[PDB]
Structures are given as structure tokens and as C-alpha cells.
């Protein structure tokens, strides 16, 4: 059927990888210097990988075990997958940019253009975001060929109460298994990799850059080679696991709530409770957000391909904002066809809540599309130094460097509230178009094309290493200046990056409440209307507290991100005063052993809450997390951004008088070295904690709904 | 009900014993006499502001719903505009005074007893102020108008439908947050740019010392530090204090007509009229019996052998207000809850007693947070330590150790709160969290007093390196300004736990707002409700908890612009001038937060009705507590680590060093956000609350979409 043709699409974008891999190998590259550096740099990488991933695969082994013993097995084997699955990606993701970075100066120097170099940084970006795509659908389609069809969970779709007094549909506990596997695995790496390489950065800004007087990317600071390998580690395969890590959950978020709005629909007719929604329509929606990821994988693929040899582009920008309506735009009209297909045999809407049936969520999925662009926009506009507020940034510098650190501060405040605007009436469209339903539909649309936003945000980190290079090789200030806008470029990517994965995971969220709610099902309860059901009062006092908890959480959190990072940031920048292996360990060992702390307590923070006060203090502490982590992390990102690319502003000397031997150079730099804890290490960890917090609840509330202490 | 009286008399006596204290040196009164003009101008241009917004607002509540309404919120407007001029008048004339006792006496007994009288005649004015307006609001009102005699939901001449005493007390509260507003916002980016604006002609090549006559900027942040902690510290505590009282009142009024059982074809209310007027009148008795023991406490203190340890005298006086307070309440909740049917209903567990139980628990949860902001601010304990020794490793490192310190430091005094919160549910319901709330700010008087003291002490200290005071003395009042910057930063603390938990209140008084005469017979269950399944609740929690976050950056901004006002203008001495330009560009860049924090529930009321709202006020307060105690615990550790490496506690190093500049610009940095950021945000998170729930009866039926 037509099924296989669709599950071969992961297959080709993995082999499209491989063969924008080859091209790189293929590349000279071998700069002697370079060479050696990026050897040392992969090797350094590869050995705190392999660390890390033996640690997080015996812990993770745990929990799937755990997983087996409390529900089904398959739900451990989901996890395992889930697992695999996000490791792979990121490996070969950075293994593709520690070779690219060398490609992209080689390319710049010998074909004398912007161009060439742009094409072969968005294919190492490229290869990071078929990576991410192919594995994670690869995994999804398999798991739903295994155990919905071949052992028939979905043909029996019957709530099983196991031991523990966990109640569950065998498949919706297995989908949720594989979602939690890959959100412990993106967080675990991105914390770690990102302590790390804030660390690092923040080190050699401060003191290489500012009290040693020298470059940005000095080759003679050790700090600055560890900045670089942390580049590679924390920027590169974090990202690739924050951003995938989003996309599986918006898309786990659709099909549990798909599969729990099978059992709830029924109407007590005769004393008899007749299921409202028929069992063929549920297994179509849930069958759907899959075909809508695939084909928007295969709009992602087209428009990357496509805009490659459309046209050797001066702005690297302006090339990334065509992909990325070019894949937006077709994954709209596909996602047209397929929504077509869907309504034909949809006769349910009424019951659902559907307005428009399927074409619906495609309206919610296309609102969705839409608000992402603009959130890229206004990220763009907050983070670019072309525009207004980081052009203010800039006369901040002239007005004092407790007035850059204040004004940065506000403008990341100020930039916060434009986007969740925009976010906002995107929900009530969601909503108005088909419910809860369409909602994680367009938390699906969202990141419809996350193949070309994972390649547009990893095309900046092989940049940075680039400039790094340059840096080193005290590269001509004019190549100095390009490989530094196209760095920029990238930082303004990651805050789009960021903003996308936050949105989509607010709007997973909404799902994962109301699947939250849809687990604190009873067959009694059943029979009690679906609405009544679906209830979560503020004014109880356990949800109200709960949410101000969530909330002092993700805040203390953000702290302890930020003295992780000048822990070992205090020990290098000593170390700097007082060798470049020994900053790499400083910043290894402090990572090694922050890292532990964040997963465990995202994955602890539900059950305790829960065996205390119940599922209502649960919810709301879902509440809560959900809304601070979304503030802090367009707050951090949209700041760290501006403050770096108004760094790389005066840098470029576009401010009159001043040059990077001025005091307000050194005063932006510093700003830099405050945002970067923020926007690359708090911010995405945020978004990642409250999607696994959801999870976790979902899975657990079945024991400490009636099993609580208080 | 004559204790108010009692109040406001017993700061006018206070008034009239320190201005009899002698004034002393010239110089002093000269160096006063600019402070105090200054002073006076900037109060001058603020409440001109004030009248023309109160008036507007008033005429509007009166439209909008009943005469009665806009009366309570002139009524409220009126008794916190004289407490606060009261008290700020009071502190100017009282730093020299002080000081000269210091001089005269060399003793740091009798300079204690000045500025502590200085600083009670500012607490008693507020508790006095408030409390009277109270009991004028319910004399008048209540009876005489038969509001609470039929207390029934009432449709005015617009159609709209409210229990009149519950939307009048709202609109007395509204007042009373305006004149907050005002002086918090007006104030906080005033002292700053004041602050910033002395601290950086000292720091740049244009160099005015920090805290020396001739400095303009030096005498407007003098100005500033009693501007800021006396009348915008106290405001913000006392608009917690009517908050907590206004909420209980509302819960009460608003149960009448929830709890209804119909029985065969009659309609029994399930709780009687009686218990809920008397659920009404007893967080009014249990406030006058905590301004009682706080006047108590007080007395004591001023009248008690002159100590040497001036810590020891402000602490016995908190103690005594809340150990009075919880005796004397123990036997008032017994006697006037006793004979109350239908308690169990509205959640008291243990009977009468369970709603001064929760009352207890709110004192308890005060001090205990007071504890941890001085555990994070001061620099004896080990994170402000942590953050000095930091300091010889790099600027960057300062500031990201400072920001992880604020960060960090939020936890444990929302862990306080969220256990305080649990008991008091547990004990007696939302009244109960309610009645925590003003257990908590039962001695407000004190506490005001206590926080005032603080700025008298840091214009103390400006003023003897101004007048190059002997070292000795000179030691004395810094020892005595270094008390009160702790107890400020303790202060602090304690008023943004007690802005969250008015939040709460209120956001719970909003719900029982959210009442209809058909949801009357629903069970209470299905009216008391704000489902988060619904797509509307969390988009308006996102969007107000956002507002938040942009609400504290431009004030930000704000600081800074009117600094570079004011640095100019003092290119163009007239210390009036420079105070009044700063007062002009501050009071004009307020105009857009109070726009935002006033009309951000009105927009999104009549767009997307109420429950949309009510996510609002949760994301409000969720993300201004957090970013209020994040900025003040920083702030505060931040300025307490430069004073520490100011205190040589870092061998090798002392003023002048590179660590020690770090130090500086950190606390630069934190000035901005301690004095403006987080008590603007409890002010915010107060102020949208109680604006949701004054418009909820026009916007729950009459929104867009
Ligand atoms: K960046
Ligand atoms: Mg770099
Ligand atoms: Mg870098
Ligand atoms: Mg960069
Ligand atoms: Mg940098
Ligand atoms: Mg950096
Ligand atoms: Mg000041
Ligand atoms: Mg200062
Ligand atoms: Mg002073
Ligand atoms: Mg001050
Ligand atoms: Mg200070």
C-alpha cells in the first residue's frame, strides 16, 4: 500500500544525509592547523560523549526496566527506542559539523564568495535535521506497525489496570514510554553539553577576550579551544536533541489524545453506554498526525534540496526564510491533499468538535505554520542587529555598561510579549477549528518542517567554529567579518529554533493536560459527561498551589543551570589568570556531575507532588511549569541573542568611534557572557522540563489519584 | 472601632516629641532642608497626577455600578495619600535629628529611640489611615444604605448585576492599590535614577562624590531613599493589609448567595445571614486587634530601658505585636466564630478556631520568609560570602553568581508559602488562606515602621560623609545605616510573600465573583470552577504571566532614560529642578505599565470573557513573585557583597580593587532591580486582580468572543 511508500520517506532522508556527508568528506578541508585542532576537538567531543552515554544508558536501561515492571513492557522497549533513536541523531549530526567547520572558511577562501560556503554550512545543518527526522519517524512507524497492529493493541484498545493500579490503553502507555525516553535523553544531553560549553564560552569572552586583550576565539586562551569543543558538543547534538525532542512530543501529545477519546465518548442509552465516537474514526486520528509528519518531512526535504541549487544567495538569512516558507508553504498544500482524504471519511465531526472536520486541524496546523513564521519574525527582530532594539543595545553601549546589562535585560522582557501575542491567537484559532484535538495538530504544524528549522539552527554552530578558525588563523577582518554575520545568522536561528520548540511545546502541553485529565478516567466516571471529566478548577487550593510550586521550580532551576556554569566558569577563569585540556576538564568534570541533578528531579517533581496532595496539585504544577518555562525561555533566548549579535555589531564597527579596543566593546562582551548561560543552557532546558514533567504525570496520575497522602 | 483613632493620634504625638527633639548644626539643617524640599516638590507633582486619576476613577466605578463605589475608592485613595505624606514628612524631619542625638548624646540608645519614633509615626499613619476608612466604609454603607441588611445581588441602572458591599469594599481597595501604584512605580524609578545617577558622576570622569553635599544627585538619592522605603515600601504592605481583609469580606459576602439548598419547592440559604456578617466583621476585629498589638509592641520599645543593641529592640517589638496578636486572636476567633452555623460547609475544619489557626500560620510563614531573603541578601551567611570571594575572579563571574544566587534564593520561601498555604486550606478553606494572609500582615504597623527606619538610616549615613562627621559618630550611624539596609533587605522579603498571597486572595474572590443568580443553584462546586482543560484559561495564563516579564523590563529602560534625563539636566545647585525634571520623565514613563497593568483584564475580558482572565491573573502571579524575589534577594546580595569587600572580609583587597569595582558594577546592576523591578511586580500581580474582579460582573457575558 501506500503505507510503505510513506515509511520509506525517513529511509531517503537518511540516505540524502549520507550523501551530504560524503560531499563533505569529499571536501578537501585539511587545513594542517585546522586539521589537527578539529581532530583534537573530536576527539575531546567523542570521548565526554561516550562518557556520558554509557551513564545515561545505564540509567536509562533502569528506567525502562522500571517501565516494564509498573506497565507494560512494550512501553519499556518504546522508551528504549525513543532513546536510540535521539543518541544517534545527535552523534551524527556532530560528527557531520566537526567535519563541515573546515569546509565552510575552505569553501569562503577558494571560491572567493558567501555563497558556496552558506550551501555547504546549511548542508552540515542539513544532515543534523534528516538525522533528527528520520529517527525519530523511523522509530515512531515501527513502534506503530509492532505493537498497534501486529500484537493488536490498538484492535483490542481495552484500559488494562495492572499492578500498582495503573490503568492504561497498552498503545497509548507505549507512545507515552518512547516520548519520555527521548525527553530524558534531550535533556540529560543538552544540560550537560550546554554547562559545558557556557562554561567555556563565558570563560574565554571574559578573560581572553576582555582581560587578556584579546580576539574573540583567541587561539593562545585555552578557554577558547574549550569554547569550541563545547560549540561542537552543547551547540550542535544538544540542539538537534532539544528540537527533536519537541517535535516527538507535540506529535505523541495528538495521538494519546486521539487514543484516549475512544473509551470516554459514550451516552448511556437504554443503560447502556454506546460509544459516541466510533473505533474506525479514532484509529484514523490517530493514524493521521503520523502521514501529516511524513509529508511534511517530504516538503522539508524538497525545499531544502530545491534552495540549494536554486540560487548562490549574498544573505544567508534571506536563503534560510526561503526554505523555511518553502517547506512551510508546501507541507500546507500536501497537508491540504491529506486533510482531504481525512474528511471524506469522517462522519464524527459533531461529536468531536470538529467545525470543518479534518480540514479543521489542517486550518489549526496552517494557523500554527503561520504563527511560527511570525514568532520568527519577531525573534529575528528582537535578535538582529539590523533592526530597532538591538540598534537601542548598541546606544545603551554609549550610555554605560550597567545601563547595557539593564537595557538587555528589559529588551529581552520587552521581546517576550509580541510572540506570545501571536502564540495566543493562534490557540483560539486552534481551538475555534477543532478542539483540543486540532490544538496538538497545530502543535504538530508547528514543527510540520522541524527537518529545515533543526538545519537552519544547526547551520550557526558550524559557523561559529568556522569563525573560531578564523580566529585562530587571524583570518582577514573582512573574511573575519563574513564568517562572524554568518555566526550571527546562526544565533538568530537558534532564538527561532527556540521559539518554535517552546510553542509547540505549549500547545503539547494543552494535549498532555487534557490527556492528563483524559488518564484520571473511571469507567464510572465514563459514563459521567466528557466535559465534566475534562475539569481542572484554579480556585481548589491544591491547584493554585500547585502552580506557584512549578513556577519556584523553573526558576530555581534557571539558577542552578547558572552556578553550574560559573562553577566551572570560576575555576577556568582562574585557571586563565593562573593549556587547553585543562579548562576542557574543568568544564567536563563540572558538567559530568551537574548534569545528574535536572532529569532527576523533572522526573521526581510529579510523582512526590502527587503521592502528597493528589492529581490536582499535579495539574497544577503542570500549570505552572508550563507557564514560567515558556516566559523564561523566550526571556532568555530573545536576550542572549540580542546581546550577541550587538557584540558582533560593534564588532563589525557599525557603531561610529568605537571598535573592539573600546570600554563599550568589553561591556558588551560581558553582556555576552551573561546571556549565554541564559539563551543557550536555561531557556531550552525549560521547554525540555516541561514537556517530561507532563508526561510523567500522565503516566503516574493513575496511582496517586486515589493513593495520595493528603 | 476607636483604635484607628488611637493610631493616628499616637503618630501625631510622635510627631509633635521628635520635632520638640533638637535640630542642632546649621549645616545638618541645611543638608536637611534641600532633602526635605526635594521631597516635597516630588510629592507635590505626584499627587497632582494622583487627583486628576482618582477623580476620573472614581466617576467611572460610580457609573459603572453604584455611587457607593467610587466614594469607597476616593475614600481609600484619600486615608493612604495622608499616611503616606505623613511619614515621608516625618523622616525628613527626623534625620538630623537623629543624628544630632547620636552627636550630642554619643550614644546609639537614644538615636535608635529618634528614628524608630520617626519611622512608627509612618506605620501608625498607615494602619490608622486604612483601618479608619474601613470602618467608615462599612458604618455608612452597610447599615445605613441596608446593603448587607438584604444582601442580595443587585442590578443597577447599566443592567449589570453585583452584590453592592462586596463591589464598594473592591472599589476601596482599588483606591488604596492606585496611591500604591503611584508611589512605588513614580517612587522606585525615581530613587533609582537618583542612585544610579550619584553612584555614576562619582564612577565617571565628571566626578561628584556619592553622598556628599555638593552632588545634586547625592542629595536626590537621599531624597529617593526615603521616598522609596518609607512611603513605597509601606504602601506596598499596606495594599497587601486591604487586600487580605477585602478578600475575606468578598469570600463571605459572595458565599451567601452560593451556598443554597433547594429544598421541595423552597430555597434555604445553607448559610444563614448571621454567619456570614460574621464571617464578614471578623478579619475587621482581627486587624484592629493586631494594630492594637502592634501599638502595644511599639510602646514598649520606645518606653523600654535604652539598649545598646538596636536589632534586638526592632525584633522584641515585631514579637511582642505577633505573639499579642496571636493570643489576643485565639480568644477573639473562639468567642465571635463559637455560635456560627454552617462552618463545616465553607471548609473550617476544627470549628470556630480553624480560621485563626490559618492566621497564626500566615505570622508564622512572615517571619520565617523575612529569615531566608536575610539569609540571601546578607553577607554573614554563606551565598553573599560566596558571591565577595567570586569577585576577584572576574565581572561576568559576579553577575552570573549573583543572578544563580537570586534564582536559588526564590526557593525556600516559596516552599514556606506553598506549606502555609496547604495548612491554612486545610484548617478553614479559602477564608482560612484568606485569614493566613492577615495573620501575616496583622502587625503591618510595626513592620512599616521597621521597614522606614531603614531610610532615615541611609540618609543617616550620606549625610555624615557629608558633613564629615567625627569618626566616631561617623562609626555610630554607619553602623546604624548598615542595620537598616538588612532590615531593608528583610523588609523586602516580606512584603512580596505578602503581595502573593493577596493575589491569591483575590484571584479566589474573583471566582467567587464569577457567581450568577441561575450558577446559584448549580452545586458550589460548578460555580467555584476555572478548568484548565479549556484552551482559554492556559492562553491567558501565558499571556499575563508574558505581560509580566515585559512589564519589568520597561521600567528598566525607564531608570535609565531618566537618569540620562536627569545627568543632563544637571549639566544645565537647584537640587528642586534636577528632582523636579526626574520626577516629570518618571511619572510620564508610568503612564504605559499602569495602562498595561490596569487595562490588560479589561481588553481581555469584553475580548474573550472570564476564565480567560482568571489564567491571567494565575500567569501574573506566578511569574511577578518569582522575578519579585529573584531580583530583591539579588539586589541584595550583590550590594551586601561590595559592602562586604568594603568590610575588608576579603584579605589583600579593599576599595579601589578590581574585584571591588566588579562588586560596583554589580551592584549598579542591582540597583534598578531591587528598589523598581520587584516591588513594582507586587504591586502588579495586587493591582490585576483586583481590577478582574471588580470588571468580571461587566465582562463574563459582554465579551467578543
Ligand atoms: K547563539
Ligand atoms: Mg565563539
Ligand atoms: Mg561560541
Ligand atoms: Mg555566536
Ligand atoms: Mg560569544
Ligand atoms: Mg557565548
Ligand atoms: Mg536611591
Ligand atoms: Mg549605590
Ligand atoms: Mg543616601
Ligand atoms: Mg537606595
Ligand atoms: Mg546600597
Known amino acids: 500500500y501506500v503505507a510503505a511508500l510513506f515509511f520509506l520517506i525517513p529511509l531517503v532522508a537518511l540516505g540524502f544525509a549520507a550523501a551530504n ?32 552515554t554509557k551513564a545515561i544508558f545505564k540509567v536509562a536501561i533502569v528506567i525502562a526496566i522500571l517501565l516494564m515492571i509498573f506497565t507494560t513492557w512494550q512501553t519499556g522497549v518504546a522508551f528504549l527506542l525513543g532513546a536510540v533513536m535521539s543518541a544517534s541523531a545527535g552523534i551524527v549530526g556532530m560528527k557531520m559539523a566537526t567535519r563541515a567547520n573546515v569546509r565552510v572558511a575552505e569553501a569562503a577562501r577558494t571560491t572567493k564568495k558567501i555563497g558556496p560556503a552558506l550551501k555547504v554550512a546549511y548542508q552540515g545543518g542539513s544532515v543534523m535535521g534528516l538525522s533528527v527526522g528520520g529517527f525519530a519517524l523511523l522509530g515512531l512507524v515501527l513502534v506503530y506497525l509492532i505493537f498497534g497492529k501486529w500484537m493488536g493493541q490498538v484492535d483490542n484498545l481495552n484500559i488494562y489496570t495492572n499492578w500498582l493500579g495503573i490503568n492504561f490503553v497498552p498503545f497509548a502507555m507505549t507512545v507515552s514510554g518512547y516520548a519520555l525516553g527521548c525527553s530524558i535523553i534531550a535533556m540529560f544531553d543538552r544540560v ?35 569554547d569550541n569543543v563545547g560549540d561542537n558538543v552543547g551547540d550542535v547534538a544538544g540542539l538537534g536533541a ?27 442509552i437504554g443503560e447502556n453506554l454506546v460509544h459516541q465516537v466510533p473505533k474506525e474514526t479514532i484509529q484514523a486520528l490517530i493514524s493521521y498526525p503520523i502521514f501529516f509528519a511524513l509529508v511534511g518531512l517530504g516538503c522539508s526535504m524538497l525545499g531544502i534540496l530545491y534552495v540549494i541549487v536554486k540560487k548562490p544567495s549574498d544573505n544567508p538569512q534571506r536563503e534560510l526564510n526561503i526554505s523555511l516558507w518553502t517547506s512551510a508553504l508546501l507541507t500546507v498544500v500536501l497537508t491540504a491533499f491529506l486533510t482531504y482524504f481525512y474528511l471524506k471519511d469522517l462522519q464524527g465531526l459533531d461529536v468531536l468538535g470538529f467545525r470543518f472536520g479534518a480540514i479543521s486541524p489542517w486550518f489549526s496546523a496552517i494557523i500554527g505554520i503561520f504563527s511560527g513564521i511570525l514568532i520568527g519574525f519577531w525573534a529575528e527582530y528582537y535578535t538582529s542587529y539590523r533592526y530597532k532594539p538591538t540598534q537601542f543595545l548598541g546606544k545603551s553601549s554609549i550610555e554605560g555598561t550597567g545601563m547595557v546589562i539593564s537595557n538587555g535585560l528589559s529588551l529581552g522582557m520587552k521581546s517576550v510579549f509580541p510572540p506570545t501575542l501571536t502564540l495566543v491567537l493562534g490557540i483560539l484559532f486552534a481551538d475555534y477549528f477543532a478542539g483540543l484535538y486540532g490544538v496538538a495538530i497545530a502543535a504538530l504544524g508547528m514543527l510540520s518542517f522541524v527537518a529545515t528549522s533543526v538545519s537552519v539552527d544547526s547551520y550557526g554552530p558550524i559557523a561559529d567554529n568556522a569563525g573560531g578558525i578564523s580566529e585562530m588563523c587571524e583570518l582577514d577582518p573582512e573574511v573575519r567579518k563574513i564568517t562572524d554575520h554568518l555566526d550571527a545568522v546562526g544565533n538568530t536561528t537558534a532564538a527561532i529554533g527556540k521559539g518554535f520548540a517552546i510553542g509547540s511545546a505549549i500547545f503539547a502541553a494543552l494535549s498532555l493536560f487534557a490527556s492528563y485529565m483524559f488518564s484520571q478516567i473511571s469507567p464510572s466516571d465514563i459514563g459521567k459527561p466528557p466535559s465534566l471529566v475534562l475539569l481542572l478548577n484554579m480556585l481548589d487550593a491544591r491547584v493554585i498551589a500547585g502552580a506557584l510550586l512549578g513556577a519556584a521550580i523553573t526558576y530555581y532551576f534557571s539558577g542552578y543551570l547558572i552556578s553550574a556554569v560559573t562553577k566551572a566558569a570560576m575555576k577556568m577563569v582562574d585557571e586563565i589568570r593562573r593549556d587547553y ?11 559530568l556531575k551537574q548534569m545528574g541533578y535536572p532529569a532527576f528531579i523533572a522526573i521526581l517533581t510529579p510523582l512526590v507532588t502527587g503521592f502528597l496532595l493528589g492529581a490536582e496539585f499535579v495539574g497544577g504544577v503542570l500549570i505552572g511549569t508550563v507557564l514560567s518555562g515558556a516566559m523564561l525561555a523566550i526571556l532568555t533566548a530573545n536576550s542572549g541573542g540580542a546581546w550577541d549579535n550587538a557584540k558582533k555589531y560593534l564588532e563589525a564597527g557599525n557603531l561610529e568611534g568605537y571598535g573592539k579596543g573600546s570600554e563599550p566593546h568589553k561591556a558588551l562582551v560581558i553582556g555576552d557572557t551573561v546571556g549565554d548561560p541564559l539563551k543557550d543552557t536555561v531557556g531550552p532546558s525549560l521547554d525540555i522540563l516541561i514537556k517530561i514533567m507532563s508526561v510523567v504525570s500522565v503516566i503516574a496520575v493513575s496511582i496517586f489519584k486515589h493513593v495520595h497522602l493528603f
Do not use: W
Open 21 to 52: 556527508f560524503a560531499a563533505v568528506v569529499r571536501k578537501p578541508e585539511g587545513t594542517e592547523r585546522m586539521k589537527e585542532i578539529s581532530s583534537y576537538i573530536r576527539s575531546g567531543a567523542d570521548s565526554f560523549l561516550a562518557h556520558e
Open 581 to 591: 585540556n585543562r579548562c576542557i576538564e574543568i568544564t567536563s568534570d563540572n558538567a
Open 242 to 268: 532539544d528540537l527533536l525532542e519537541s517535535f516527538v512530543g507535540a506529535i505523541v501529545s495528538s495521538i494519546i489524545l486521539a487514543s484516549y477519546m475512544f473509551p470516554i465518548y459514550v451516552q448511556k
Open 192 to 226: 550537560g553539553g550546554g554547562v559545558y560549553t557556557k562554561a567555556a564560552d563565558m570563560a574565554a569572552d571574559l578573560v581572553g577576550k576582555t582581560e587578556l586583550n584579546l580576539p574573540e576565539d583567541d587561539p593562545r586562551n585555552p578557554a577558547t579551544i574549550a
